[PDB]
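G., before I forget:
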Amino acid sequence: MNLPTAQEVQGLMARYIELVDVGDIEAIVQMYADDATVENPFGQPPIHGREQIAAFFRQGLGGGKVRACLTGPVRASHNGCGAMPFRVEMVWNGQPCALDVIDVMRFDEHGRIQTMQAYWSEVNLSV
Amino acid sequence: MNLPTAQEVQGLMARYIELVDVGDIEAIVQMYADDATVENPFGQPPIHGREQIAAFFRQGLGGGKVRACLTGPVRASHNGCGAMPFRVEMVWNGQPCALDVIDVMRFDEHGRIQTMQAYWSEVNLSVREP
Ligand SMILES: C[C@]12CC[C@@H]3c4ccc(O)cc4CC[C@H]3[C@@H]1CCC2=O
Ligand SMILES: C[C@]12CC[C@@H]3c4ccc(O)cc4CC[C@H]3[C@@H]1CCC2=O
Ligand SMILES: [Cl-]
Ligand SMILES: [Cl-]
Ligand SMILES: [Mg+2]
Ligand SMILES: [Mg+2]
Ligand SMILES: [Mg+2]
Ligand SMILES: [Mg+2]
Ligand SMILES: [Mg+2]
Ligand SMILES: [Mg+2]
């Protein structure tokens, strides 16, 4: 069996959303493997490795005006993978909005995200 | 239809839990590709094809009482895919249970589910009342 137990996958993925809810970049980017991949959104060309993932997050979060929170428990397999539902709250045209997302993560043998997919699209907006 | 737009996804996946909830096995199994592949749970080998899928739904839904609902919105993409959060209420050896689940699905070029991964485990079970 290190590779997170279904249990631990729960605590980790939950820590990711808090980092994200605070905007700590640097901390987000360390939760990933050095060579990870992000598909955000799913359906698009991946990215790859921490340098590009720090940049993605710098462009997405860095300008503030983002909160996120789980909207139900993390789900977690026996192999290293979990899925979670969350909602991001931001600001469009100077007014609130939102975005409902599901991330799906696969942790390595060191408990670092290796992959991930972020399910969403424009239907998942609102006000 | 053909490959389903993000909007069409949302409707197929929400129907699918309506069918699960009502327990119309036969109409569910038909929401799949005739050779679809179910990983339920994700981590355990798959199954495959409409006869083993059926068999799985009969085993899981055939006694009535299982209630399923969506606990938030279907998330949907642009490449024929979606993911959704829900909860399954079921009584297990005298007990009242619930299992929080997320299903990830891909559809086909024909509005049929080609693959389903279900994410879950005992950390998602609660012995509680619906
Ligand atoms: C960048 C983003 C906020 C941060 C979201 C985010 C953050 C972390 C994550 O694992 C997934 C996602 C999915 C959508 C992202 C939003 C798209 C538009 C926006 O303002
Ligand atoms: C089979 C099952 C009921 C039906 C659930 C179900 C139904 C549809 C679906 O797309 C995913 C799942 C995941 C869990 C399934 C339960 C595990 C124990 C049980 O009795
Ligand atoms: Cl939930
Ligand atoms: Cl949700
Ligand atoms: Mg916070
Ligand atoms: Mg490595
Ligand atoms: Mg908050
Ligand atoms: Mg119903
Ligand atoms: Mg086919
Ligand atoms: Mg109901």
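The interface with chain B takes residues 6-7, 10, 41-43, 71-73, 75-79, 81-85, 100-102, 104, 119-124 of chain A (CB under 8 Å). The helical segments of chain A are 6-22, 25-31, 49-61.

More on Monday.
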